[PDB]
Design a protein around this ligand. Structure first.
Ligand SMILES: [Ca+2]
Ligand SMILES: [Mn+2]
Length: 242
C-alpha cells in the first residue's frame, strides 16, 4: 500500500513542506492566513491565496487499476467584520493537476477560470462559499462539492458562527466512491453533513496536488478572513489488486 500523510497541529513560517501562493502567509502565531489582512487589522478585498502540500499525491494507478481512499481534517475560521457591503467569497479544499498555479480569484475561489463545466479542469473541491454568485444557490454560506466546475453538483447551507473555529472532516471511500464531508462548530454544537458519489478516476489525474485556497471579493470592503489553524491529510493506495 502506497501511503502518504502529514499533520500540522500548528503552522511554522519557513516550513518547506508547504508551498504558499498569492497572498497566503503563515503568521508568527502559527496561523495560516489564506487571504491578506491589512495593517489596520481589517481583511483586504481582491485577495487570493493558496497553500499546497509540497509533494504530489498518488491518487489512482492505471497499471493496477486501484484507487486511493483518503481523509483530510482542518480547522478554520471566517470572520466577517461587516454586514455591508456583502462579504465574499470563501475558501476551498481542492485536488487538481500537479504544478498548478492560482486560477481566477473572487467567486472562482482561486481554482477555476469561469463558471463552465469543463473536464479539462481535472479538479475536485469542497468549498465553504460565503457569497451568492449567479451560479450559486441563494443561500450563503453553503458547503459545496465541486467537480470540474464552480457550479456545485451538491450544496448544503450552513450558519456561520462569525469568527469562531470550525472543524472539518472530509473522507473519500474508494470502494463506494462516496465523498463525505462534515462541518462542526464546537462553539454552538452545530453539525452539518453532505455527501455525494464521485469517481475520482474519471475526474482527477493519477498524481495530484492537494491544497487549500481562499479569496475575497472584487468590490471594496467585500472581504472576510480565511484563517486555517491546523491541517492533516492521509491517503492509502492499494499497490495491487489480485
Ligand atoms: Ca460564490
Ligand atoms: Mn457555491
Amino acid at each position: 500500500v502506497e501511503t502518504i500523510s502529514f499533520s500540522f497541529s500548528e503552522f511554522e513560517p519557513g516550513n518547506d513542506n508547504l508551498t504558499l501562493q498569492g497572498a497566503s502567509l503563515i503568521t508568527q502565531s502559527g496561523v495560516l492566513q489564506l487571504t491578506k489582512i491589512n495593517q489596520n487589522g481589517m481583511p483586504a478585498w481582491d485577495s487570493t491565496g493558496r497553500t499546497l502540500y509540497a509533494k504530489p499525491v498518488h491518487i489512482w494507478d492505471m497499471t493496477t487499476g486501484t484507487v486511493a481512499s483518503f481523509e483530510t481534517r482542518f480547522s478554520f475560521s471566517i470572520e466577517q467584520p461587516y454586514t455591508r457591503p456583502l462579504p465574499a467569497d470563501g475558501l476551498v479544499f481542492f485536488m487538481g493537476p500537479t504544478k498548478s498555479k492560482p486560477a481566477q480569484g473572487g467567486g472562482y475561489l482561486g481554482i477555476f477560470n469561469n463558471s463552465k463545466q469543463d473536464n479539462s479542469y481535472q479538479t475536485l473541491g469542497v468549498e465553504f462559499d460565503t457569497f451568492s454568485n449567479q451560479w450559486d444557490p441563494p443561500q450563503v454560506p453553503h458547503i459545496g462539492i465541486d467537480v470540474n466546475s464552480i457550479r456545485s453538483i451538491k450544496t448544503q447551507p450552513f450558519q456561520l458562527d462569525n469568527g469562531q473555529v470550525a472543524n472539518v472532516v472530509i473522507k473519500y471511500d474508494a470502494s463506494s466512491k462516496i465523498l463525505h464531508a462534515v462541518l462542526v462548530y464546537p462553539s454552538s454544537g452545530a453539525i452539518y453533513t453532505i455527501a455525494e458519489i464521485v469517481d475520482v478516476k474519471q475526474v482527477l489525474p493519477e498524481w495530484v496536488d492537494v491544497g487549500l485556497s481562499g479569496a475575497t471579493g472584487a468590490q471594496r470592503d467585500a472581504a472576510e478572513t480565511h484563517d486555517v489553524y491546523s491541517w492533516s491529510f492521509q491517503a492509502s493506495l492499494p499497490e495491487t489488486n489480485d
